[PDB]
């Protein structure tokens, strides 16, 4: 089963897919190809929870039910700046305007 993800750090969001059976480390390899930071300089999160390299995405709760093309699941990403890791930070998207009267 394919799972559909948004990998998010600060103001960066990667749309990609992966196998349910693929590992956190293998997702870091994806991120490495794109953002040019090695797995070992990366932390990945589900919500606030650090994910272990060797675990599958399924075991971390990314399933076909929850990680859909039209509603992908979010993986948090933090980089190790030189020595130590930054705190996980993710900028929210902008706020929609108020519904117009004729739409309320």
């Amino acid at each position: 089963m394919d799972v559909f993800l948004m990998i998010r750090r600060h103001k960066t969001t990667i749309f990609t897919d992966a196998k349910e059976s693929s590992t956190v480390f293998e997702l870091k390899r994806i991120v490495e190809g794109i953002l040019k930071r090695p797995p070992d300089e990366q932390r990945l999160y589900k919500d606030d929870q650090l994910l272990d390299d060797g675990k599958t995405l399924g075991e971390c709760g990314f399933t076909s039910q929850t990680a859909r093309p039209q509603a992908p699941a979010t993986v948090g990403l933090a980089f190790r700046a030189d020595d130590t890791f930054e705190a996980l930070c993710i900028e929210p998207f902008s706020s929609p305007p108020e519904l117009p009267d004729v739409m309320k």
Binding site: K11, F15, R68, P69, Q70, F93
Partner: protein, 89 residues
């Protein structure tokens, strides 16, 4: 996969597969006019939804597996319509 970067008006960077972005004739023209594009007029809450659409469309075109509704929140519907018209998506 080769990737391209799509940047919203508020500076959010959406990184998507190249193959997905060329679904849009407008974006293809903007990239061959580089692998980054800036959208002065599309905020992140709209452009994020556009990227989900690419994923959705590529997954379900020519699929016998029953297709689910592409969801659009009312609050963003109006701006997404304008973006879709510009992007011809």
């Amino acid at each position: 996969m080769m990737y391209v970067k799509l940047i919203s008006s508020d500076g959010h960077e959406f990184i998507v597969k190249r193959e997905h972005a060329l679904t849009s004739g407008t974006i293809k023209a903007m990239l061959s006019g580089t692998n980054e594009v800036n959208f002065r007029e599309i905020p992140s809450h709209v452009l994020s939804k556009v990227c989900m659409y690419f994923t959705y469309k590529v997954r379900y075109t020519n699929s016998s597996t029953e297709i689910p509704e592409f969801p659009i929140a009312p609050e963003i519907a109006l701006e997404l319509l304008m973006a879709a018209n510009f992007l011809d998506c």
